[PDB]
Enzyme design. Structure first.
Site, short mmCIF file in Angstrom:
data_model
loop_
_atom_site.label_atom_id
_atom_site.label_comp_id
_atom_site.label_asym_id
_atom_site.label_seq_id
_atom_site.Cartn_x
_atom_site.Cartn_y
_atom_site.Cartn_z
N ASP A 186 0.83 -1.40 -0.06
CA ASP A 186 0.14 0.08 -0.10
C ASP A 186 0.72 1.24 -0.05
O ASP A 186 2.03 1.26 0.46
CB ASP A 186 -0.98 0.14 1.34
CG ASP A 186 -1.89 1.13 1.24
OD1 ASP A 186 -2.52 1.41 -0.02
OD2 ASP A 186 -2.25 1.66 2.20
N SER A 187 0.27 2.37 -0.50
CA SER A 187 1.10 3.70 -0.45
C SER A 187 1.08 4.24 1.06
O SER A 187 1.85 4.93 1.40
CB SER A 187 0.51 4.71 -1.16
OG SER A 187 -0.87 5.17 -0.82
N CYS B 131 -4.55 -1.20 -2.40
CA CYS B 131 -4.17 0.06 -2.62
C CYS B 131 -5.32 0.43 -4.07
O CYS B 131 -4.68 -0.55 -4.84
CB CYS B 131 -2.89 0.67 -2.83
SG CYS B 131 -2.68 2.18 -3.49
N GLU C 284 -6.94 10.02 8.67
CA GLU C 284 -5.47 10.02 9.24
C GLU C 284 -5.13 10.56 10.53
O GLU C 284 -4.34 10.45 11.12
CB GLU C 284 -4.43 10.08 7.92
CG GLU C 284 -4.48 9.23 6.82
CD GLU C 284 -3.15 9.50 6.04
OE1 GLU C 284 -2.48 10.55 6.05
OE2 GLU C 284 -3.05 8.31 5.34
N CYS D 258 -11.76 3.42 -1.33
CA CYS D 258 -10.71 3.82 -0.71
C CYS D 258 -10.35 2.93 0.41
O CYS D 258 -11.14 3.08 1.37
CB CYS D 258 -10.48 5.33 -0.48
SG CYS D 258 -9.11 6.08 0.25
N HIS E 15 -8.87 3.78 3.23
CA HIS E 15 -9.15 4.52 4.34
C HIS E 15 -10.65 4.60 4.94
O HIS E 15 -10.90 4.72 6.01
CB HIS E 15 -8.53 5.84 4.10
CG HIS E 15 -7.19 6.27 4.16
ND1 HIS E 15 -6.24 5.94 3.31
CD2 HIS E 15 -6.33 6.70 5.05
CE1 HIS E 15 -5.01 6.21 3.49
NE2 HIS E 15 -5.23 6.94 4.66
#
Ligand SMILES: [Ca+2]
Ligand SMILES: [Ca+2]
Ligand SMILES: [Cl-]
Ligand SMILES: [Cl-]
Lengths: 266, 265
Positions: free
Chosen positions: A9-10, A72, A151, A183, A185
């Site tokens: 993942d990034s 991702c 985040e 996404c 997140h």
């Protein structure tokens, strides 16, 4: 002889997929790599993203993995086909599993897709969905603020509620009955999104189906482990190990985890 | 001639519980279905004979040009899956692993009940698969030989079905089991009755949905999904076509179905 499931993942969002793997595949060791020094990937050129994704891939392959998840949405779109062709371990991304889960959950074939600008611009989800079911109508909505809210830890607060209501108001004008969280997140916001959307809408955490596909593929290749007794998970990051550890140990309920700093590319 | 079908094999009408979910999740894929009605039940047959029969059905559908096989029968999966996977050049899956994933996703206390045939229970395929995924699961299995008979007779909505379900399942009420896997593909036709009997603290699981998602995933993985606009499913039975249609049309909502009788021996 015990080998890990690899995740690339990034950043930290792919941890929401790891979370479902811990639940559904408790005997399997996970090796996760978050390239937080270079995230976000969404803004970057496809060639560059493939190059970065290969760097992460090569690092985990050296470490001994029996399967790879590209956890991702951007990397999945940019590199999945080439990596799957060159490696001789199973490789999946999160987009086909999320699409499958949506098609299972929908009843009127009207589906919403939430993601980053890059994801929604790619049309990856509509392409997957429509390839499987031509009757589906897909409304795609970029949600630029969501990654920051998650985040920063605001995803349960009053800020998240306002941000969700603001961003998703357009969807209230539709008859969509299913929303894909496109996404990794966004699952942290799932309870707030369900509240805003209401009881007639299925909200899809694509990590749940991704984990099931990992389990199915492991079974298909006779690669499922029978015990968790010598499990040693490893977490790797190119950015701050402390900031990463702080988030991960909370999301995964793993107070004792270790995060390894690594250096990729340049 | 450019589309190829997905094949499904079963002892009778049970496999239709997987087909229903394939029609939902994969609406452009063609189904070829074979039910060995004349030799149902497979439940009390020896493993060698189940494998022999499963191979007969396999050969029939392979000769009709299927691109993937689903063993939509639990005892057959236990008997023959690995051998058929290993010998065929097309993807082959069974129904025990998806049922096992689905049950583990639904359980809150890790206490699972498995309903199946004599053969499925004897094989211990379910406890083995379940504990292979989560070693802390507790599994109890119950053999329900009358269930297939009630379903194949078209009596699965009747007073007799209600009695038979009550008779067989009463012991599960003395436990803390919170999840019941329908570990015979016939049993979802009885699901409303089983749900009503068990009550709302118990998740009753039809693993057709999880099986169909695996079919979808494997087709995509191997670049085998149909991309054409061809519009015709085919059903084959070794018994009476009319009795098969009466049940299939009830379970699937497909008024214009094509059902043909065949001989396997
Ligand atoms: Ca054809
Ligand atoms: Ca226990
Ligand atoms: Cl039996
Ligand atoms: Cl069976």
């Amino acid at each position: 002889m015990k080998q890990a499931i690899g995740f690339i993942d990034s950043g930290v969002g792919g941890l929401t997929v790891v979370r479902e793997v811990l639940k559904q595949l408790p005997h399997e060791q996970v090796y996760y790599l978050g390239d937080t020094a270079r995230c976000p990937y969404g803004p970057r050129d496809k060639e560059e993203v493939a190059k970065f994704t290969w760097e992460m891939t090569n690092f985990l392959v050296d470490r001994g993995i029996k399967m790879l998840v590209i956890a991702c949405n951007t990397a999945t779109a940019a590199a999945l086909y080439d990596i799957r062709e060159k490696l001789d371990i199973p490789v999946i991304g999160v987009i086909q599993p999320g699409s499958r889960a949506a098609l299972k959950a929908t009843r009127n074939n009207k589906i919403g897709v939430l993601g980053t600008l890059g994801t929604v611009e790619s049309m990856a989800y509509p392409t997957a969905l429509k390839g499987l079911n031509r009757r589906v109508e897909v409304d795609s909505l970029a949600c630029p603020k969501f990654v920051s809210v998650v985040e920063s830890g605001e995803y349960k607060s009053a800020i998240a509620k306002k941000v969700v209501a603001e961003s998703l108001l357009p969807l209230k004008s539709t008859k969509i009955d299913t929303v894909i969280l496109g996404c990794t997140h966004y699952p942290l916001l799932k309870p707030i999104i369900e509240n805003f959307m209401g009881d007639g809408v299925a909200v899809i955490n694509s990590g749940e189906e991704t984990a099931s596909e990992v389990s199915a593929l492991l079974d298909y290749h006779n690669l499922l482990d029978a015990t968790d007794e010598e499990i040693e998970h490893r977490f790797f990051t190119t950015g701050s190990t402390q900031i990463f550890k702080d988030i991960a140990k909370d999301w995964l309920n793993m107070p004792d985890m270790t995060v390894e700093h690594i250096k990729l590319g340049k």
